[PDB]
A paper describes a structure:
NA, which is a sialidase, catalyzes hydrolysis of terminally linked sialic acid and functions as the receptor-destroying element of influenza A and B viruses. Additionally, influenza A NA is further classified into two groups: group 1 (N1, N4, N5 and N8) and group 2 (N2, N3, N6, N7 and N9), based upon primary sequence. Group 1 NAs contain a 150-cavity (formed by amino acids 147–151 of the 150-loop) in their active site, whereas group 2 NAs lack this cavity. NA inhibition assays were carried out and complex crystal structures were solved for laninamivir, laninamivir octanoate, zanamivir and oseltamivir in order to elucidate the structural basis of their inhibition.
Laninamivir octanoate complex structures with p09N1 and p57N2 were solved at 1.6 Å and 2.2 Å, respectively, demonstrating that the laninamivir octanoate prodrug can also directly inhibit NA without further processing. Furthermore, we confirm the binding of the prodrug, laninamivir octanoate, to p57N2, with a similar binding mode to laninamivir. The complex structure of p57N2 with the laninamivir octanoate prodrug has a similar binding mode to laninamivir and zanamivir, however laninamivir octanoate in complex with p09N1 is completely different. Additionally, p57N2 Arg224 forms a unique hydrogen bond with the laninamivir octanoate 9-ester carbonyl, and p09N1 Asn294 and Ser247 form unique hydrogen bonds with the laninamivir octanoate 9-ester-O. However, the novel conformation of the laninamivir octanoate-p09N1 complex disrupts any hydrogen bonding with Glu276. ***The laninamivir octanoate 9-ester-carbonyl forms a hydrogen bond with N2 Arg224. The native His274 is also further away from Glu276 in our p57N2-laninamivir octanoate structure and does not hydrogen bond with it. In both structures, there is no observed electron density corresponding to the octanoyl carbon chain indicating that this part of the molecule is highly flexible and does not engage many stable hydrophobic interactions with p09N1 or p57N2. The disordered octanoyl carbon chain likely destabilizes the interactions between the NA active site and the laninamivir octanoate 8-OH and 9-ester, which is indicated by the lower electron density surrounding the 9-ester. Hence inhibition of p57N2 by laninamivir octanoate was much better than for p09N1. The overall lack of hydrogen bonds and instability in the p09N1-laninamivir octanoate structure relative to p57N2 provides the structural basis for higher laninamivir octanoate inhibition of p57N2 observed in our study and a previous report demonstrating better laninamivir octanoate inhibition of H2N2 and H3N2 viruses over H1N1 viruses.
Numbering used by the authors:
A (entry chain C), B (entry chain A), C (entry chain D), D (entry chain B): 82 to 469
The structure:
Amino acid sequence: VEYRNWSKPQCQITGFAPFSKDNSIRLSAGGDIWVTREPYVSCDPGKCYQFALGQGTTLDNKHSNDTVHDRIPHRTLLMNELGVPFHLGTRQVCIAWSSSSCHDGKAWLHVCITGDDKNATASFIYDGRLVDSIGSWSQNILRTQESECVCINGTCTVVMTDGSASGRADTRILFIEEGKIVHISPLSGSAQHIEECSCYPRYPGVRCICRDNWKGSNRPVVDINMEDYSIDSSYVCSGLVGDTPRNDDSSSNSNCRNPNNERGTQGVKGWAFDNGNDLWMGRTISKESRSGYETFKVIGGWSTPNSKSQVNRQVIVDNNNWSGYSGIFSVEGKSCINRCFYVELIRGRPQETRVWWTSNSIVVFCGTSGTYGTGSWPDGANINFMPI
Amino acid sequence: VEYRNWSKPQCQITGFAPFSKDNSIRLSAGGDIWVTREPYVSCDPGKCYQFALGQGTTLDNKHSNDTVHDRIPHRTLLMNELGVPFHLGTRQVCIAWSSSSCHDGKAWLHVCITGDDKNATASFIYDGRLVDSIGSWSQNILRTQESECVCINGTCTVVMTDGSASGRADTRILFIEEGKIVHISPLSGSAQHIEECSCYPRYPGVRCICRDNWKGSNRPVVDINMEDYSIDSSYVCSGLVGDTPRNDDSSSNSNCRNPNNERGTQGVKGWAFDNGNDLWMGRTISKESRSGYETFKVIGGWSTPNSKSQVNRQVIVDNNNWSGYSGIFSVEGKSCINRCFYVELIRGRPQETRVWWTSNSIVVFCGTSGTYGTGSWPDGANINFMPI
Amino acid sequence: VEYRNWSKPQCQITGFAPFSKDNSIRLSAGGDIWVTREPYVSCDPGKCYQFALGQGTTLDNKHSNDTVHDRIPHRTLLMNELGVPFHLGTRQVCIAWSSSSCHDGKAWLHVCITGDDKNATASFIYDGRLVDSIGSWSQNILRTQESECVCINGTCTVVMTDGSASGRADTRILFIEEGKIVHISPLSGSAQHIEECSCYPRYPGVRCICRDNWKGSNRPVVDINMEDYSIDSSYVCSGLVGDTPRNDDSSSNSNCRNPNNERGTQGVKGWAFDNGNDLWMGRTISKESRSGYETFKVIGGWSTPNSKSQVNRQVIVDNNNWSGYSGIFSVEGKSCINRCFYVELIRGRPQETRVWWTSNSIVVFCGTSGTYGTGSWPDGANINFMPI
Amino acid sequence: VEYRNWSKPQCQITGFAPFSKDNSIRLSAGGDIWVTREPYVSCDPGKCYQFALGQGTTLDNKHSNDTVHDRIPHRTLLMNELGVPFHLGTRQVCIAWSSSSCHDGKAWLHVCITGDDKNATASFIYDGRLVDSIGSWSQNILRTQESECVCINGTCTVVMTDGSASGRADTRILFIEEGKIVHISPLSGSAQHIEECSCYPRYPGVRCICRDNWKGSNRPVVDINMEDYSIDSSYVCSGLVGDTPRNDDSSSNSNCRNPNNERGTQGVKGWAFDNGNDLWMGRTISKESRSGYETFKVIGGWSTPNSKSQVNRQVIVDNNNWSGYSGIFSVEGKSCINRCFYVELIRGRPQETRVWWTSNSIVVFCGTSGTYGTGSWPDGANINFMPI
Ligand SMILES: *[C@@H]1O[C@H](CO)[C@@H](O[C@@H]2O[C@H](CO)[C@@H](O[C@@H]3O[C@H](CO)[C@@H](O)[C@H](O[C@H]4O[C@H](CO)[C@@H](O)[C@H](O)[C@@H]4O)[C@@H]3O)[C@H](O)[C@H]2NC(C)=O)[C@H](O)[C@H]1NC(C)=O
Ligand SMILES: *[C@@H]1O[C@H](CO)[C@@H](O[C@@H]2O[C@H](CO)[C@@H](O[C@@H]3O[C@H](CO)[C@@H](O)[C@H](O[C@H]4O[C@H](CO)[C@@H](O)[C@H](O)[C@@H]4O)[C@@H]3O)[C@H](O)[C@H]2NC(C)=O)[C@H](O)[C@H]1NC(C)=O
Ligand SMILES: *[C@@H]1O[C@H](CO)[C@@H](O[C@@H]2O[C@H](CO)[C@@H](O[C@@H]3O[C@H](CO)[C@@H](O)[C@H](O[C@H]4O[C@H](CO)[C@@H](O)[C@H](O)[C@@H]4O)[C@@H]3O)[C@H](O)[C@H]2NC(C)=O)[C@H](O)[C@H]1NC(C)=O
Ligand SMILES: *[C@@H]1O[C@H](CO)[C@@H](O[C@@H]2O[C@H](CO)[C@@H](O[C@@H]3O[C@H](CO)[C@@H](O)[C@H](O[C@H]4O[C@H](CO)[C@@H](O)[C@H](O)[C@@H]4O)[C@@H]3O)[C@H](O)[C@H]2NC(C)=O)[C@H](O)[C@H]1NC(C)=O
Ligand SMILES: *[C@@H]1O[C@H](CO)[C@@H](O[C@@H]2O[C@H](CO)[C@@H](O)[C@H](O)[C@H]2NC(C)=O)[C@H](O)[C@H]1NC(C)=O
Ligand SMILES: *[C@@H]1O[C@H](CO)[C@@H](O[C@@H]2O[C@H](CO)[C@@H](O)[C@H](O)[C@H]2NC(C)=O)[C@H](O)[C@H]1NC(C)=O
Ligand SMILES: *[C@@H]1O[C@H](CO)[C@@H](O[C@@H]2O[C@H](CO)[C@@H](O)[C@H](O)[C@H]2NC(C)=O)[C@H](O)[C@H]1NC(C)=O
Ligand SMILES: *[C@@H]1O[C@H](CO)[C@@H](O[C@@H]2O[C@H](CO)[C@@H](O)[C@H](O)[C@H]2NC(C)=O)[C@H](O)[C@H]1NC(C)=O
Ligand SMILES: [Ca+2]
Ligand SMILES: [Ca+2]
Ligand SMILES: [Ca+2]
Ligand SMILES: [Ca+2]
């Protein structure tokens, strides 16, 4: 088994096709299913796996009460094959209220953060054993991507932040070989706040589309050079911005360089990727709440500041239903690298107060060069049918 | 591992022997089991797997209410080893309210259809990744076999229809290599309506026995040439017809060429296969409802129009019990290719209204050249013992 | 992978040591566990599996009512790794209300009987596919071993009976190669009634200790010659007889040749094996009911008619607790063949009427050349804690 | 596959990082989970497994009542991949109320003790078959490590004791090759009472840190020579002693040679390991009860009698939360052997009398050469939310 290089051209895509759905919440109403949030997807050379941060409890369980909270010692990283719901036989891979995972072609790497808010620790698990760890450097919620990291030629990269959620923070990019941290580069460039990066291989380098939780409703971009460890950053050009909250389409802006200062505070994990001058992206349909989900291509969305010409829109989740986090993952095909994405479908608190828990299911789509129709694939659970 | 060729003679059979039963409904009264319908069986070179379309819920679950409906966004293709009930550890292979699966000798292909009725999308998944997709071509419920597709020398074939359920439709035959559509041939021949084909390898080609939902209670036949992609079609000769509804044996007819216009509208997925001039087939015992199941050989049933001389009858499910869909699958033996079949055993609505759900279990038989006795292997659940 | 030959001397044992226990009934009171009976154990070259005949239902399930009955269409053969309880993820290997399984060194053989009492069918499944089948020859409950069959050099042998439970019956020995019946020999010798044989490899042949349900409380012996298919039979010499019911130790007899006509009617599956002139055997402690279980060595028990000198007794289940069926299995060690046995621990009806179901757990012991102490390992469930 | 030699230097560590947590009790409140105690962790060359002694029942189950008791016939050794909770699909590896497991590089060895207090039997299972067994030698609760044994070059060593819990007993060290006992050495040296050793490879030998239940609150040390089977023993030098109960830090003593006679009676399983003259160890935070858990390094703690200079302390479980047993396990890295430990988190009786059961979850940490922060990772279950 050889290290992955991802050295194939990116697949030409016309849009995305349905790939997977786990129906977690619907199942939780009649079965023992983990309470989760912050899910993602990543694949080894053979097959795909779904991940999520458990809350150390199932849903029909009094411990599900008040699981809206982000960080407790009982959160662990869950790992199943894609499409296998998080049942009681699910393996907890490590202790984590923040995590990232990727396969280098030989074995799995897991980056897992847990512990006190002011003094967290990140554990690096490779091939089933703990190889390294690092402590918080800003004493303010060390946190990472909540989606797959990416490895090229045996070196994996992952983006971590420590510091304010609403002000300048300390972002660093780690380079890891077989679980061992070999280099750390400070964030550099014009991005002013970085969280929860959705990264993908763009041989010879790596590209990440992130969340600015401070001043921008446009998404920061981070470029990682795997040859000399240099870092660059900026913002997605598209005038159709990908964060939530954000201004409506007629009054939103991006100049590619700075945060737009348009409803910039707060945000949601999301993704996008470049194709020449064009940009493929997803976003919530609602501009102020984590509701609905849509994807489209923006003409000149990568190269032209403020471009708002859109095409090939697809509704993934209609605006009558809740969404949440979303992220990218890459799949090596026979001749090219395909891009896929997942959408987190959050149910319960704070939006739905009949119940006392917070959880999610997922829906997953993959890039296609073929054709496709329309639909809507929401969580699908009836809140009135749920254990409270 | 090499591609399958299925280039062996068909096993000479004297009838069928008991092979498997999953007892799904009985187990649902005391455990968490998926609500399903439209099951089928397919085998890789090593072992058999049962498939079914989930309803995104377990049975003892308020979400099981009103699952009689055919198409919702939450339906997914379930896949287990044959004989493992669909418990919560079951993998959802893809999003689908219509599907087909087959193994080409190296990897699994799954064809999955989901989305809006008027604008559905079919996804083609091969070796665990999305390789292709196609959109609806007649904007009227794109739909496929609900049983195994078949592959010869790395090329898999699958029958898809789009259009009217009770009128002329648009049926196409797809040829797929490693998930990629390489050719599409329109239906051709004298079959006037084609749905839910049960196909089997008949080297060098593929033969399908289908469901005519429009004018025929006789079953359409589709012949697929894998070498030049040419298609031919007709109807099964046997005057003992295999659809439901149908006329009784004394007044049923087939001329091998046209639909018989005998209680032709509506129908049920079924199967049959040729052996020289003779025909092996299954059918519901009841001529008007999906009740009971029987198999038998029709002498001259393949070659002689309107033949009604039957032999080697076996009751599979007695007429006091509900059946449903049925389909064929092929298993490669040491010297020959065996033919097996599964029967869907539908419980709940519309027939049993004490409960609000609709689900099924299955029973499976395989061709034998030995001897056998008699019996009846129904679902066996007591409707009064079920969660409503 | 090569065929098993079992061509090593038998291990010299001083008794038996604890090997496994599944705690099924205890777990059934707080989880979804199959209702079973007629368990057995068989190992492939790597690891052991437990088998049982399910009743198509879990215990905490209204369908468990009246599962005292031996034969319904919903009984299937269950197969798990030894020590894994029969939970909802258990694979149902085939339809069976009577069965036998064994591994020839390359793949598993399963012999499964189901259908009408007067016209049953036996299916032979090898390497996950149906290879052969045979119908009832006496039209009176075709039935087999309910424990492992044994294979030498690619040929497996299994003992089947069809006919009266309380009179002369028609017993046949089948020889099966890769699932294909290659020869059938009639029972021969002086054994007058044969049921439920516990067989073991005794290179170059196979030896079975069985149940006489008609005239003997002494156990019949069947000797199977794998080279020329010839059969011989007689009775265990030991004056300490292994069946239940039976006379007490001071008035029980055996002449090695004929049934003893001592409370000979009815019986229970049991086992024994020769070591030179001596005999290792197990039996219920009670002489009239399936209560308790003990093993011991009888000096001259194999060669000397009516020998009653016992040594190395071990209590497996104390007489205050229910037992049931028991059987042998053989495990190839580095230099020798070891013998092990399991005991079925039956709970519920007819003996315990607070509940309406009948089920079992198991305990398993293996021969040892080392030393050991004492104990008692019963089912352990509190009938008052059980779902009725 | 080759035998393990553990012939690499010990990893230089700065402390420990979070590795795993199973949340068993929290999950038991909403799911079917085994009642357990005496857990441990051990790894094959590829992955880690968690073990525990089941009580033959799940938690939400009337049979969970009064599971505070240490020894019943229904206790079995449970084995899952690390991070997989003990659900109903868990394999019971053997019958045991005391056990030890390890992998020699080729296969698993399991040492399982069960039976009467005064006449117990230890079974030795290697590669899935029983190879040896030994009976009680002092007729007073034969017992072993309750943590992993260790194997060097095909020979595994395990420490067993039989006799008084509060007086001189008979401790022996067994050397086992492929399940077969090849030598037995009596304990030797100055350690006066030995129980529940936590052993680790220290090439060319094996070192164990144990529990003195009679006269010492300082932990005994057992040194095992794998080449000539010679044994030596003593006590840990550190004046900061590791047992519970124990004196507080200002009046606790150890002279390296004798039990300290400081609250020596009773105790708890624990661990420690040497690095040059220094010592890494864990212990409960409370000095009289199994509450809280902490780790630290004692400068000169291995070589200097009564040393009390501590550094690199970490809280694992805060003193508001219950702990219990703990033990070491070793993981082979690319260049070095790392040391890890697990902590048993006991909930229920005798400490929490609202419920009638006794069970545990676990948390697991591994040695790191990196950095880390702080936290607390207790069981986390709310006793008021539990089935009683
Ligand atoms: C059957 O399914 C197909 C495939 O999904 C579908 O074709 C798609 O239709 C959409 C909607 O018209 C197209 O996307 C649009 O592209 C135009 C540019 O030509 C954009 O201007 C659109 O964006 C504007 O309008 C959106 C609302 O539709 C707004 O939300 C947005 O803010 C803009 O104002 C939009 O991106 C897409 O290109 C095609 N896809 C393909 C491959 O042709 C078809 O419509 C479906 N059939 C039916 C009858 O529903
Ligand atoms: C024990 O099991 C064996 C094997 O199953 C069984 O033998 C079978 O009996 C059936 C029923 O008689 C045979 O099938 C028949 O074949 C005749 C031609 O010879 C047909 O005419 C029959 O069809 C007519 O009758 C059917 C009702 O039985 C009608 O439904 C149908 O419409 C026709 O009117 C039927 O096909 C079959 O050939 C044998 N099988 C073999 C291999 O011999 C036997 O009867 C069983 N014994 C008992 C006592 O149950
Ligand atoms: C600790 O464990 C060991 C091993 O289990 C145990 O030693 C065994 O004791 C039994 C009982 O005495 C021995 O078996 C007996 O052998 C004598 C011949 O020497 C037989 O006569 C006995 O059978 C008669 O008595 C039985 C009641 O015990 C009756 O049930 C039976 O009908 C006969 O009348 C019996 O077979 C066995 O040989 C030893 N095993 C060994 C290897 O020594 C020991 O006793 C245990 N210690 C205690 C105090 O529990
Ligand atoms: C963030 O996390 C880091 C890493 O855990 C942490 O640094 C650690 O702090 C502890 C506690 O101060 C240090 O351990 C101490 O070492 C000194 C020797 O210098 C000992 O004297 C201490 O033992 C005494 O005090 C203990 C109470 O803390 C008593 O329980 C004990 O009986 C002794 O009286 C203790 O061992 C440790 O060395 C560092 N680790 C490293 C690598 O620096 C830091 O404090 C955390 N920061 C915050 C603000 O949470
Ligand atoms: C979830 O936990 C909350 C907090 O304990 C529960 O709500 C509280 O219930 C108490 C008692 O009725 C009230 O006095 C408090 O005012 C409530 N707190 C809040 C924040 O409203 C709630 O009952 C729990 N939910 C369930 C289903 O157990
Ligand atoms: C399943 O859903 C049906 C339809 O919603 C429920 O039946 C309805 O119940 C309401 C409330 O009593 C009535 O007003 C409607 O008239 C009912 N509809 C019909 C068609 O009867 C039914 O209660 C649900 N079943 C279960 C078991 O919850
Ligand atoms: C198991 O089934 C039996 C039979 O249906 C039930 O017992 C019967 O109950 C009816 C109605 O009360 C009585 O009239 C019969 O006399 C009973 N039959 C017998 C044989 O006694 C029984 O209730 C069921 N058990 C459970 C727990 O549901
Ligand atoms: C667990 O078992 C205990 C002991 O059997 C049960 O407590 C007993 O209950 C009986 C009946 O009420 C009393 O007479 C005894 O005095 C109790 N024993 C003690 C020592 O208190 C208890 O009910 C069981 N717990 C549960 C939840 O079923
Ligand atoms: Ca923002
Ligand atoms: Ca029709
Ligand atoms: Ca008898
Ligand atoms: Ca002590």
